[PDB]
């Protein structure tokens, strides 16, 4: 193509820091909701599903925090900043093996 979308293949240490904090912030929203309901003895299927198949920022590997799965790439990995609205959508899990 001749139209230039200058998007670097890797992120800067500043974009990574904000990513860690956005993943950390989401964990606090879920924990705040889960703790508020536990005090009343209630549960929500969405929360129970999140805490079951989604890790916390402290439990994620750097590769899972800054990259995503892409079957079209050489090594099946791709910069997470290449996902649409990547700063406002949740993305923490990739297929096993990649």
């Amino acid at each position: 193509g001749g139209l230039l979308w200058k998007i670097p293949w890797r992120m800067s240490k500043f974009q990574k820091l904000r990513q860690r904090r956005r993943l950390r912030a989401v964990d606090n929203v879920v924990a705040t909701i889960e703790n508020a309901l536990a005090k009343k003895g209630e549960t929500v299927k969405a929360v129970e599903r999140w805490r079951a198949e989604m890790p916390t920022e402290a439990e994620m590997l750097p590769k899972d925090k800054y990259t995503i799965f892409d079957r079209k790439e050489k090594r099946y990995r791709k910069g997470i900043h290449k996902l649409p609205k990547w700063t406002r959508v949740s993305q923490r899990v990739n297929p096993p093996g990649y």
Binding site: R22, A25, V26, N28, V29, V30, T32, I33, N35, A36, L37, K39, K40, E42, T43, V44, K45, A46, V47, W50, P84, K85, T87, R88, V89, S90
Partner: protein, 138 residues
């Protein structure tokens, strides 16, 4: 308890379904805060916009008047002396010095009723040609 929910990010380029979740919460602009009880029907509403809002558990709900007073700054001044003025509906309010505290408002259809000096008050002052300051004062 209650959920103190505040919109931190926008949903401009997000799907239409996300706009409805925010509309059902009452979040219309950034940094707008709402209060909802701690219930499943509201928790699930937050798990859909958890990437956009900030949540907090609070004991009680704050009123629209009490939620806006926590950002109100101190005025930084106090009117201690008000000069004579005319209020269209009430009347003429005489000078008041709140430092020594008396806002007396006089209304009428004649000048003497307003509490001001008239042409007659100036003529009696001019005819008092005998009053003289005390020699000690001079």
């Amino acid at each position: 308890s209650f959920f103190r929910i505040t919109l931190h990010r926008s949903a401009i380029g997000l799907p239409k379904r996300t706009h409805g979740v925010l509309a059902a919460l009452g979040l219309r602009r950034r940094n707008q805060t709402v209060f909802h009880p701690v219930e499943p029907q509201f928790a699930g509403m937050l798990m859909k916009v958890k990437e956009l809002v900030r949540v907090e558990e609070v004991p009680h709900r704050l009123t629209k008047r009490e939620l806006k007073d926590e950002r109100k700054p101190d005025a930084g001044f106090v009117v201690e002396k008000q000069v004579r003025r005319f209020i269209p509906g009430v009347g003429v309010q005489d000078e008041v010095d709140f430092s020594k505290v008396g806002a007396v408002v006089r209304d009428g259809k004649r000048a003497g009723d307003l509490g001001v000096r008239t042409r007659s008050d100036w003529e009696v002052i001019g005819k008092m040609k005998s009053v003289l300051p005390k020699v000690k004062a001079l």
